[PDB]
Enzyme design. Structure first.
Site, PDB file in Angstrom:
ATOM      1  N   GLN D  10       0.822  -1.202   0.000  1.00 53.14           N
ATOM      2  CA  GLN D  10       0.000   0.000   0.000  1.00 53.14           C
ATOM      3  C   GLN D  10       0.856   1.252   0.000  1.00 53.14           C
ATOM      4  O   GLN D  10       0.494   2.253  -0.621  1.00 53.14           O
ATOM      5  CB  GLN D  10      -0.933  -0.007   1.206  1.00 53.14           C
ATOM      6  CG  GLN D  10      -2.170   0.853   1.057  1.00 53.14           C
ATOM      7  CD  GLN D  10      -1.908   2.305   1.378  1.00 53.14           C
ATOM      8  OE1 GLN D  10      -0.858   2.652   1.913  1.00 53.14           O
ATOM      9  NE2 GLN D  10      -2.866   3.165   1.059  1.00 53.14           N
ATOM     10  N   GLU D  61      -3.985  -6.316  -2.209  1.00 54.98           N
ATOM     11  CA  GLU D  61      -5.360  -5.857  -2.211  1.00 54.98           C
ATOM     12  C   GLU D  61      -5.669  -5.120  -3.506  1.00 54.98           C
ATOM     13  O   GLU D  61      -4.824  -4.395  -4.036  1.00 54.98           O
ATOM     14  CB  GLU D  61      -5.636  -4.936  -1.020  1.00 54.98           C
ATOM     15  CG  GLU D  61      -4.867  -3.625  -1.027  1.00 54.98           C
ATOM     16  CD  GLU D  61      -3.591  -3.686  -0.210  1.00 54.98           C
ATOM     17  OE1 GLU D  61      -3.222  -4.785   0.250  1.00 54.98           O
ATOM     18  OE2 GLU D  61      -2.951  -2.631  -0.027  1.00 54.98           O
ATOM     19  N   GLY D 134       2.179  -6.664   5.782  1.00 59.79           N
ATOM     20  CA  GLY D 134       2.489  -7.990   5.284  1.00 59.79           C
ATOM     21  C   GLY D 134       2.731  -8.006   3.790  1.00 59.79           C
ATOM     22  O   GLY D 134       3.690  -8.615   3.310  1.00 59.79           O
ATOM     23  N   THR D 135       1.868  -7.323   3.035  1.00 62.24           N
ATOM     24  CA  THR D 135       1.935  -7.378   1.578  1.00 62.24           C
ATOM     25  C   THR D 135       3.309  -6.970   1.068  1.00 62.24           C
ATOM     26  O   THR D 135       3.886  -7.631   0.201  1.00 62.24           O
ATOM     27  CB  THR D 135       0.862  -6.476   0.970  1.00 62.24           C
ATOM     28  OG1 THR D 135      -0.417  -6.803   1.527  1.00 62.24           O
ATOM     29  CG2 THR D 135       0.822  -6.647  -0.541  1.00 62.24           C
ATOM     30  N   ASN D 196       8.387   7.698   9.211  1.00 63.04           N
ATOM     31  CA  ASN D 196       7.248   8.587   9.020  1.00 63.04           C
ATOM     32  C   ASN D 196       7.145   9.702  10.044  1.00 63.04           C
ATOM     33  O   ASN D 196       6.862  10.836   9.668  1.00 63.04           O
ATOM     34  CB  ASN D 196       5.948   7.785   9.015  1.00 63.04           C
ATOM     35  CG  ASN D 196       5.541   7.373   7.624  1.00 63.04           C
ATOM     36  OD1 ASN D 196       5.899   8.027   6.651  1.00 63.04           O
ATOM     37  ND2 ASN D 196       4.788   6.287   7.520  1.00 63.04           N
ATOM     38  N   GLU D 244      27.543   4.282  -8.417  1.00 62.89           N
ATOM     39  CA  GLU D 244      28.464   5.017  -7.569  1.00 62.89           C
ATOM     40  C   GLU D 244      28.016   5.084  -6.117  1.00 62.89           C
ATOM     41  O   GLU D 244      28.860   5.276  -5.239  1.00 62.89           O
ATOM     42  CB  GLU D 244      28.653   6.429  -8.103  1.00 62.89           C
ATOM     43  CG  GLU D 244      29.463   6.481  -9.367  1.00 62.89           C
ATOM     44  CD  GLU D 244      30.935   6.649  -9.090  1.00 62.89           C
ATOM     45  OE1 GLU D 244      31.634   7.223  -9.946  1.00 62.89           O
ATOM     46  OE2 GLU D 244      31.392   6.211  -8.016  1.00 62.89           O
TER      47      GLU D 244
HETATM   48  N1  LIG Z   1       5.190   7.649   4.249  1.00 59.23           N
HETATM   49  C1  LIG Z   1       4.210   6.867   3.818  1.00 59.23           C
HETATM   50  N2  LIG Z   1       3.905   5.717   4.504  1.00 59.23           N
HETATM   51  C2  LIG Z   1       2.910   4.918   4.073  1.00 59.23           C
HETATM   52  C3  LIG Z   1       2.191   5.245   2.940  1.00 59.23           C
HETATM   53  N3  LIG Z   1       1.270   4.283   2.740  1.00 59.23           N
HETATM   54  C4  LIG Z   1       1.394   3.360   3.719  1.00 59.23           C
HETATM   55  N4  LIG Z   1       2.399   3.748   4.554  1.00 59.23           N
HETATM   56  C5  LIG Z   1       2.875   3.017   5.731  1.00 59.23           C
HETATM   57  O1  LIG Z   1       2.582   1.652   5.545  1.00 59.23           O
HETATM   58  C6  LIG Z   1       2.254   1.057   6.776  1.00 59.23           C
HETATM   59  C7  LIG Z   1       1.193  -0.014   6.573  1.00 59.23           C
HETATM   60  O2  LIG Z   1       1.587  -0.915   5.566  1.00 59.23           O
HETATM   61  P1  LIG Z   1       0.731  -1.015   4.217  1.00 59.23           P
HETATM   62  O3  LIG Z   1       1.571  -0.742   2.997  1.00 59.23           O
HETATM   63  O4  LIG Z   1      -0.450  -0.092   4.318  1.00 59.23           O
HETATM   64  O5  LIG Z   1       0.188  -2.514   4.175  1.00 59.23           O
HETATM   65  P2  LIG Z   1       0.941  -3.577   3.250  1.00 59.23           P
HETATM   66  O6  LIG Z   1       2.433  -3.390   3.313  1.00 59.23           O
HETATM   67  O7  LIG Z   1       0.435  -3.452   1.838  1.00 59.23           O
HETATM   68  O8  LIG Z   1       0.509  -4.984   3.883  1.00 59.23           O
HETATM   69  P3  LIG Z   1      -1.038  -5.313   4.168  1.00 59.23           P
HETATM   70  O9  LIG Z   1      -1.723  -4.179   4.894  1.00 59.23           O
HETATM   71  O10 LIG Z   1      -1.104  -6.560   5.010  1.00 59.23           O
HETATM   72  O11 LIG Z   1      -1.721  -5.555   2.846  1.00 59.23           O
HETATM   73  C8  LIG Z   1       1.747   2.171   7.668  1.00 59.23           C
HETATM   74  O12 LIG Z   1       2.399   2.113   8.911  1.00 59.23           O
HETATM   75  C9  LIG Z   1       2.123   3.455   6.971  1.00 59.23           C
HETATM   76  O13 LIG Z   1       2.952   4.222   7.806  1.00 59.23           O
HETATM   77  C10 LIG Z   1       2.497   6.399   2.247  1.00 59.23           C
HETATM   78  O14 LIG Z   1       1.865   6.698   1.241  1.00 59.23           O
HETATM   79  N5  LIG Z   1       3.510   7.213   2.689  1.00 59.23           N
HETATM   80 MG   LIG Z   2      -1.267  -3.576   2.765  1.00 55.32          MG
END
Ligand SMILES: Nc1nc2c(ncn2[C@@H]2O[C@H](COP(=O)(O)OP(=O)(O)OP(=O)(O)O)[C@@H](O)[C@H]2O)c(=O)[nH]1
Ligand SMILES: [Mg+2]
Ligand SMILES: Nc1nc2c(ncn2[C@@H]2O[C@H](COP(=O)(O)OP(=O)(O)O)[C@@H](O)[C@H]2O)c(=O)[nH]1
Ligand SMILES: Nc1nc2c(ncn2[C@@H]2O[C@H](COP(=O)(O)OP(=O)(O)O)[C@@H](O)[C@H]2O)c(=O)[nH]1
EC number: 3.6.5.-
Lengths: 329, 146, 426, 427, 426
Positions: D10, D61, D134-135, D196, D244
């Site tokens: 995500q 997803e 997880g993803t 973050n 580099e």
């Molecule tokens: N800086 C930043 N962090 C993000 C962003 N989108 C998600 N995150 C971080 O991603 C974390 C959650 O992981 P996700 O990517 O949403 O979920 P996933 O890695 O796809 O795994 P699943 O939720 O199980 O499908 C959160 O703690 C957010 O801080 C973004 O657009 N910018």
């Molecule tokens: Mg996710």
């Protein structure tokens, strides 16, 4: 720049009316949000949106609240009916917010607008710029294109595009969303007009692959004017099956009222069938006579039975013997 | 309430059962209405003369009353008030007629009965969509015997 | 896409199912005749989770109403949105159990759940990829508790790979409707602690007190209770139905809230909840939501968490928000009242955001708290069950049907070991 | 000279969505796919008047991807470069690394291979993932694993969204983080942390945004990416390709963890008044209050640094600024490397994203440093991981997916080994 | 930035607050319906001090109502500027005290304080930087004296690092409102000197002669007395809401006013006061405004300030003035009657100048007096206490609800010493 005294310093701790509703925006852009708001933000809808009426929750529509209720008889002998009115289950009405809030503004849709004034046009790769040079007598281009293609070929084209649209939505419970992906989704100004390169684009997003010469043939058929806009509601009805065309339309009325009016039109059409052939002599007889009781004698004498159920169907039509037999003609 | 004794005004709020509002008996204290904007002095609460304040002749059953910015639209009156207006202000019967502040509510759609599948008869088939538990239809044995 | 099949059991399940399908019909803008009336196209892309297309733009729900008495079915088809349900989905017996869990689990099931299994299986394979099942029923009444309980057993034995949510109403001793509330509550919870994935405890005591204090309604009917729990259920399914900045599916919530397979009892709260006379005076801001959410008087269970501890927590935010104030408020509520949390897990709070608030609202939040204060509730039920079983009251209307005493004993042992393990983790 | 970008999870998709928006904006590409040669590294030119990116989004997803599909940039990303499964991993390395990967990773692998083959002078891979979810974490490690055994020799630069120390969005974040790093260590060439809270406070402090969202962060991240890939994209007085980075910042095969900092972070209100010279922006890129990673290099010691300069920069001044930084003993270097600087200069000044907040600037600096505060960070993560693991929480999830406590034990000791390694090299 | 909390307890303190929020809501230009209609932008600059925008620009006052009898909850909500107080902020009892300090501080204080502590604490976190607190209540009532001073003690315990402003009415010998005045007056004084930081005592007899002789009103109803008090209270917080040449916040007042932690009982005064009959025969100048300040007939306390000395004082000016004229006007009055100020302090008076005169005038001031003639008040009430205490009259109402004589013995002990230290310095 923004140098007027109304705009404030970024390091400003004084109060600004409505700064607790802004987000993801710099202070000066936030001050621009409050004064001159964009349609997407809440500051806009709290000031310049008409209120939606929820008339069932209004206490004013219940007239028994203006006066205190007065006692009536509760004597078992001094009564007229032995069944007290059953209390209706009160409807679940709990107001949680103002109905003006249209909630459908996704984050991506707000963050990732087309970031210039000319990029939301979204042209196709293959396009004829000479046609957007507003060259003279677009109708001649339509006529020439249609005379170059031939009418029998458009029938093949609509048929094969019918086969493609039938082939697209195989099986899902979201197949209506993809149907709306044709025109209505990526659309504003819900007046159903589509320009020619926009049409070519929406067609190639699905795989029609129309050449401009075949394209302008469709326009000579479905737009015999120099406007160059297409009414897709007339078009896609031919491509879609009628059972799934309703999904693309979104709203079709299944109301009992509309059914009853469809019943009324059927009765009046049957009665028109009845009095039709014999309408020629009825007017002569009526002029030889107007009351309804007299109309029974006229209509029965000329040969048609006219009864109470006939008068109730004809009540919305008339009340005039002249216009009566005329609408029967 | 317009008290003819003191020419004071009192706005009582009526409450509905299961309204979202906390019960408060009164909505505006019994003091004479200003009817105008007066340059306030911080020391002395303004002394309002009768000419400045509202009068019984001002309510005309269809007008707007600027009660402290709020614009109330008065739309009725009691029998004693109507009689009093006819007696003392020479109003006609028609002016005292209450105006209707009512807005309609639209019914719900309530989808129609489906057209019949051509398998049974119309009457035996209508029951399936009419009710959940299907009932056999009823006949006019009254006309049968007769 | 990701599919949710709904199951409603008993008179309560029927009514809250009707209100849930009412609010779902509203949020997806489908009329009481089953045709779309909305404006934005965001609504059409995620109706597959709850509606199946039939003909001419008629989306019918993927739900199963289950009961034993025709009065509830009349109540279903009387109100609005009562003619959008397929008559084949009104699986329904004829006799009626009447607050007998044995009649609910052995006699009438043998002739009902077969047909129920048929319709749910046909409705399972009508869609492709399930997210899981959602069930709403009672624990005090008979035909909802036992029948739905046996259905919970049968679906878990056929399909273990799908998620499972159980919204069950638990009795409270002041709002004490039935006499055999213990005899049916313990047997239901004894079954769902092994069958159910996770559970959301409901009750009418906290809900009545919420409509009194926070909503100031004089005479609220059950329907308003149903509307509140309806908002709760929409808030928990909002992620699969709408996009956002950080999605959280049902599996995501279960894995972030259940640290142990027998620790699956949550506490539910909902915000914002203010009287319409007080709607005009307050702001709508993240702490303004958070203060109402973490308050003790907003939970939908009769358990004060200040008498216990939180294991985990979850918050689902709907509406265009600022993620910074979201998680800084979560961090502040986690830091200031630091005594009310477990120690051996940092960051007990899961948060998510979807960019669509419910219709009429601007910004909302749904709270799910795995706390150990639920053992107070189960203890309150245990002591009364012991009080009754100490000298065998009302027992014969159970033993005379197929049950025996060891069912009660194993039920008591399960609940007692459960409340001991909850007390241990405190 | 082309690089192929990959985005996982995500987060990965959103970062790429902002990153690609910036790319199209810079090269002058309308969101329809074409303009009204420097683009060759990102936008393949198919047919005529078309520019399709060498990018992939992959996710379990379907929500965020379909959103991308039907958003504003519908014609740009053609519908096959955006892989979407049918259900997510739901914050679980195991479900991501063993079950769902075995069906997604093959299609991702067979797709990138023909993308690489259509490319000619491929420079490397650039991965943005989030190890908290997880993803990303599970599938990302799985993809990198298959990526390494396929090619290996080609570089892989990894930008990872670790968990923040105090603020967190999840619960099983430590499990997923450690299970990712145990393979992230040996597979990623150069790793870069993008926490973050770090950016939250930066946006709050510098660009005085009171209530931001992820998009502000995503835009600053995309700005970082463009400023460090500018050397390949444009011509400068002294450019450096991606090969580099590792050469000048990776002194050891398992010491690759960079810290990122940017300058200047100035909104339009402060831009007009601030005299922006290369001196202070090079000074500003060194404060701990201006880092993309929540850490303190004061407690640490720099290992090597790399300075990318964009815009009107004369090499005399950058040379003067690096010299006065070197002489200022508020920061202290390692003795394992006396001359620990790399420089790169590009003429093209950064672009402005309408809808962003950074005013148009003359010059910008991006600093990438290696230090030991990272080893401090990993231990601070380790502490709270063991805090939870000691009680065997949430582990039933993982053993049910099919894994065992052995991977837990090996990840714990691997972190411990890395801990001891970073302490030692710090001396 | 800085935020004031306003607390209205009792019957007296309630009505004055209603009159207070009129003159405040007038200056910042919000109208009785809650909408801002000011013209200049020097009014919105500091609107947060006394209000919050909720939504739709409806600014709600940040103040808590508190009492025990439903009578006042009408006479506040009903009156003009009554539709702005938050209906949540009407925390409220049910029985009513009735001149008994025991019932207002020991019986109902058990079950109401944590209820009023709830909203107050909540509102404390609602704003960002508390400036202090500000209470209006009586000293002879039951709820104002009991439930007021009880809250006073409670809030100091939670927030020790904030100020405290008490606008209190005190009894008078001739105009005896209740019969247990010396009881409830003493029992509150012994409570105030430890928790209340500075007490601006008021009375009625000293306002009646002000309304009758200066304002030359013939029917000086409470709507007039409460208006004067409403003017002074707004004059105190002048510099928190407007610019000025020499600002003086709440604490900047206390530091120049309190030489010893227990000599903090002020008298207040306001200028310029003339009847509308002679408004246009006089000149409005600093030389003239001042001779109305330092007049004795112009205090709002029935203590002739000539029967003692002034330890310190303070003069808060408003409107465009020439500071050189202020400073020399404050100098001559300090030298010419030098026998009225204390010898062991230089610069007995602090002057401060805001830049906006109040609506309805063009130049205004406000006098705040820390004089030692205020001891003649506590003498009257203390010596009365012994008169009743020698006979134990009316005692059993007090010791009929938990209180004991020993508390009364200390009220003597506490009062008699603070009238000693006043007398030590004269
Ligand atoms: N800086 C930043 N962090 C993000 C962003 N989108 C998600 N995150 C971080 O991603 C974390 C959650 O992981 P996700 O990517 O949403 O979920 P996933 O890695 O796809 O795994 P699943 O939720 O199980 O499908 C959160 O703690 C957010 O801080 C973004 O657009 N910018
Ligand atoms: Mg996710
Ligand atoms: N919240 C809510 N609770 C209900 C409703 N209907 C019934 N209940 C509760 O359900 C319990 C009785 O359920 P019951 O009708 O006997 O279930 P059944 O007999 O198995 O169908 C009581 O405790 C009620 O409080 C409803 O519409 N809303
Ligand atoms: N100045 C002024 N004093 C008032 C007002 N109302 C009451 N009082 C005084 O308050 C005292 C009585 O207070 P009381 O009703 O006993 O307070 P409570 O019963 O504890 O709420 C009397 O001495 C009055 O002089 C008012 O509107 N203005």
């Amino acid at each position: 720049p923004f140098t007027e005294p109304e705009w404030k310093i970024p390091g400003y701790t004084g109060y600004v009316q409505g700064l607790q509703e802004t987000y993801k925006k710099t202070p000066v852009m936030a001050q621009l949000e409050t004064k001159d708001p964009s349609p997407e933000s809440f500051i806009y809808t709290r000031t310049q949106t008409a209120p939606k009426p929820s008339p069932v929750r209004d206490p004013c529509n219940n007239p028994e609240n203006f006066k205190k209720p007065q006692p009536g008889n509760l004597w078992p002998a001094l009564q007229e009916t032995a069944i007290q009115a059953s209390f209706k289950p009160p409807t679940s009405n709990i107001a949680l917010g103002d109905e003006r809030i249209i909630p459908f503004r996704t984050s991506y849709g707000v963050d990732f607008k087309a970031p210039f004034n000319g990029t939301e046009q979204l042209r196709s790769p293959n396009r004829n710029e000479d046609l957007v040079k507003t060259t003279s007598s677009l109708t001649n281009i339509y006529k020439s294109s249609f005379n170059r293609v031939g009418e029998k070929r458009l029938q093949k084209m609509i048929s094969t595009m019918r086969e493609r649209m039938e082939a697209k939505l195989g099986n899902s419970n979201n197949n209506a969303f993809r149907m709306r992906k044709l025109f209505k989704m990526y659309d504003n100004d819900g007046s159903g007009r589509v320009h020619f390169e926009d049409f070519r684009n929406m067609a190639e997003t699905f795989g029609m692959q129309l050449d401009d010469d075949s394209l302008m043939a469709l326009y000579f058929v479905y737009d015999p004017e120099g406007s160059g806009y297409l009414e897709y509601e007339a078009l896609v009805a031919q491509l879609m099956s009628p059972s799934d065309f309703a999904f693309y339309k979104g709203y079709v009325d299944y109301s009992q009222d509309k059914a009853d009016e469809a019943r009324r039109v059927e009765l009046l059409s049957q009665l028109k069938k009845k009095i039709g052939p014999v309408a020629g002599d009825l007017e002569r007889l009526l002029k030889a006579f107007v009351s309804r009781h007299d109309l029974v004698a006229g209509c029965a004498s000329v040969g048609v039975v006219l009864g109470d159920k006939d008068f109730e169907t004809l009540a919305p039509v008339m009340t005039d013997y002249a216009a009566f037999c005329a609408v029967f003609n | 309430h317009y008290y003819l004794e003191d020419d004071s005004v009192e706005v009582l709020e009526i409450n509905e059962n299961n309204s979202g509002r906390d019960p408060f008996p009164v909505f505006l204290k019994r003091g004479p209405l200003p009817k105008v904007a007066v340059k306030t002095n911080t020391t002395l609460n303004p002394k309002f003369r009768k000419d400045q304040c509202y009068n019984a002749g001002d309510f005309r059953l269809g007008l707007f009353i600027n009660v402290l910015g709020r614009d109330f639209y008065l739309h009725d009156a009691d029998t004693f008030t109507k009689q009093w207006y006819k007696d003392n202000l020479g109003y006609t019967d028609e002016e005292m007629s209450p105006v209707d502040v009512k807005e309609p509510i639209l019914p719900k759609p309530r989808a129609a009965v489906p057209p019949f599948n051509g398998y049974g008869t119309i009457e035996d088939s209508l029951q399936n969509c009419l009710s959940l538990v299907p009932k056999p239809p009823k006949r006019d044995l009254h006309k049968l015997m007769n | 896409m990701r599919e949710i099949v709904h199951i409603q059991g008993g008179q309560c399940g029927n009514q809250i199912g009707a209100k849930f399908w009412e609010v779902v019909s509203d949020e997806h803008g489908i009329d009481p005749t089953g045709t779309y009336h909305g404006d934005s196209d965001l609504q059409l892309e995620r109706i597959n989770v709850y509606f199946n297309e039939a003909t001419g733009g008629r989306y019918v729900p993927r739900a199963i109403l289950m009961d034993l008495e025709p009065g509830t079915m009349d109540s279903v088809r009387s109100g609005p949105y009562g003619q959008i349900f397929r008559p084949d989905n009104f699986v329904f017996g004829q006799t009626g159990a009447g607050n007998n869990w044995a009649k609910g689990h052995y006699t009438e099931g043998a002739e009902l759940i077969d047909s129920v299994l048929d319709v749910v299986r046909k409705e399972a394979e009508s869609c492709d990829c399930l997210q899981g099942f959602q069930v709403c029923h009672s624990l005090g009444g008979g035909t909802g508790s036992g029948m739905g309980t046996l259905l919970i057993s049968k679906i878990r034995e056929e399909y273990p790979d799908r998620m499972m949510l159980t919204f069950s109403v638990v009795p409270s001793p002041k709002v004490s409707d039935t006499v055999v509330e213990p005899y049916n509550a313990t047997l239901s919870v004894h079954q769902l602690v092994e069958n159910a994935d996770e559970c959301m405890v409901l009750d009418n005591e906290a809900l009545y007190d919420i409509c009194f204090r926070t909503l100031k309604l004089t005479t609220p009917t059950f329907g308003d209770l149903n509307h509140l729990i309806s908002a709760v259920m929409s808030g928990i399914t909002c992620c699969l139905r709408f996009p956002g900045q950080l999605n959280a599916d049902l599996r995501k919530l279960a894995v972030n809230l259940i640290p142990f397979p027998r620790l699956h009892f949550f506490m539910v709260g909902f915000t914002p909840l203010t009287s319409r006379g007080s709607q005009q005076y307050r702001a709508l801001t993240v702490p303004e939501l958070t203060q109402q959410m973490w308050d003790a008087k907003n939970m939908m269970c009769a358990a004060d968490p200040r008498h216990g501890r939180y294991l985990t927590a979850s918050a689902l935010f709907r509406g265009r928000m600022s993620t910074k104030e979201v998680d800084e408020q979560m961090l502040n509520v986690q830091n200031k009242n630091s005594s009310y949390f477990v120690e051996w897990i940092p960051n007990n709070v899961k948060s998510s955001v979807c960019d669509i608030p419910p219709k009429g609202l601007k910004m909302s939040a749904t709270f799910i708290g795995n706390s150990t204060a639920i053992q107070e509730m189960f203890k309150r039920v245990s002591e009364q069950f012991t009080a009754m079983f100490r000298r065998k009251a009302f027992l014969h209307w159970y033993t005379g049907e197929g049950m025996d005493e060891m069912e009660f004993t194993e039920a008591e042992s399960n609940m007692n070991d459960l409340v001991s393990e909850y007390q241990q983790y405190q | 000279r082309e690089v192929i970008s990959i985005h996982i999870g995500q987060a990965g998709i959103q970062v790429g969505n902002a990153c690609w928006e910036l790319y199209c904006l810079e090269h002058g590409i309308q969101p329809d796919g074409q303009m009204p040669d420097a683009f060759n590294t990102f936008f393949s030119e198919t047919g005529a008047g078309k520019h399709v990116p060498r990018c992939i989004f992959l996710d379990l997803e379907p929500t965020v991807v379909d959103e991308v599909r039907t958003g504003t940039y519908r014609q740009l990303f053609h519908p096959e470069q955006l892989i979407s499964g049918k259900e997510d991993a739901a914050n679980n390395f195991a479900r991501g690394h063993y079950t769902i990967g075995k069906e997604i990773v093959d299609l991702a692998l067979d797709r990138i291979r023909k993308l690489a083959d259509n490319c000619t002078g491929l420079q490397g891979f650039l991965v943005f993932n989030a190890v908290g979810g997880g993803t990303g974490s599970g599938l990302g490690s799985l993809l990198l694993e298959r990526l390494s055994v396929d090619y290996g020799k080609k570089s892989k630069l990894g930008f990872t969204v670790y968990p923040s120390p105090q603020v967190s969005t999840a619960v099983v974040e430590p499990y997923n983080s450690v299970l990712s790093t145990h393979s992230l260590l040996e597979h990623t060439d150069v790793a870069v942390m993008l926490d973050n809270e770090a950016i939250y406070d930066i946006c709050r402090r510098s660009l005085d945004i009171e209530r931001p969202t992820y998009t502000n962060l995503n835009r600053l991240i995309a700005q970082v990416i463009s400023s460090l890939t500018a050397s390949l994209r444009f011509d400068g007085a002294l450019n450096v390709d991606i090969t580099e980075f590792q050469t000048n910042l990776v002194p050891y095969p398992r010491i690759h963890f960079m810290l990122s900092s940017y300058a200047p972070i100035i909104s339009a209100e402060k831009a007009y008044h601030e005299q922006l010279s290369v001196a202070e922006i090079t000074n500003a890129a060194f404060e701990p209050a201006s880092m993309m990673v929540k850490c303190d290099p004061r407690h640490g010691k720099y290992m090597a640094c790399c300075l990318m300069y964009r815009g009107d920069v004369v090499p005399k001044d950058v040379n003067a600024s690096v010299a006065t930084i070197k002489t200022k003993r508020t920061i202290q270097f390692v003795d394992w490397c006396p001359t620990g600087f790399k420089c790169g200069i590009n003429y093209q000044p950064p672009t402005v994203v309408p809808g962003g907040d950074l005013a148009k600037v003359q010059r910008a600096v991006c600093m990438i440093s290696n230090s030991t505060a990272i080893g401090e960070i990993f231990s601070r993560l380790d502490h709270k991981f063991d805090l939870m693991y000691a009680k065997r929480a949430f582990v039933h999830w993982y053993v049910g997916e099919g894994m065992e406590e052995g991977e837990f034990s090996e990840a714990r000791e691997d972190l411990a080994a890395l801990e001891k390694d970073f302490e030692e090299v710090g001396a």
